[PDB]
Structure 1
């Protein structure tokens, strides 16, 4: 049906916008601390600590399958990246501090993303 097609075009345009958001967030991580999953070969104890690992590559896979239905879902995964790092790593570490700086800088990007999603529909 045409109504199904129109819903599919909307998901496609959300996907486009979330790709630009994902790129902008990821530029805020020039060290590439959050680029890839934590390897269970190098942090064997990770999944004892962190129940829902997340990283930018994982998000990009989901996005490319149009797997985010709304901005809230995308934000959930971005918050996992930050919040997982802030739990596993101590305050005095480069990892924790990188997560704080990503959260702060990413707030800007997500604030306008929300306005664009609401405005375009």
Structure 2
């Protein structure tokens, strides 16, 4: 149907906007602490602690399958990255501190992304 195609074009356009959001968020992690999933070879107990692991590569795979239907879904995944790190790691670690910084810096990017998604429909 033409309606199905128009909906598909909206999803494609959201995907393009989310890709730019994702790149901007990931620049706020220059140490690449959150680039890849936590290794279960190197942290074998990780899943006893963290029930829903997340990282920027896993988000990028979802994104390219047009797997985010809306900004809310994308933000949920970004929040997992931060929230998981702040539970597993103590306050006085480079990991926790990197999460705090990513959160604070990402807020700015997410604030405007929300206005753009609302604005462009």
Please indicate the TM-score interval, normalised by the length of the shorter structure: over 0.9
The corresponding residue for 1:5 is: 5
Question: TM-score when scaled to structure 2?
Answer: 1.00
Q: What displacement does 1:4 show? A: 0.2
The corresponding residue for 2:23 is: 23
CA deviations on 1:28-84 (whole Å, 9 max, x unpaired) are 000000000001000000000000000000000000000000000000000000000
1-structure distance, mates of 2:113, 2:61: 20
RMSD: 0.1
1-structure distance, mates of 2:30, 2:39: 20
2-structure distance, mates of 1:116, 1:71: 10
Q: Which runs of 4+ in 1 moved over 4 A?
A: none
Question: TM-score when scaled to structure 1?
Answer: 1.00
Q: Which runs of 5+ in 1 are unaligned?
A: none
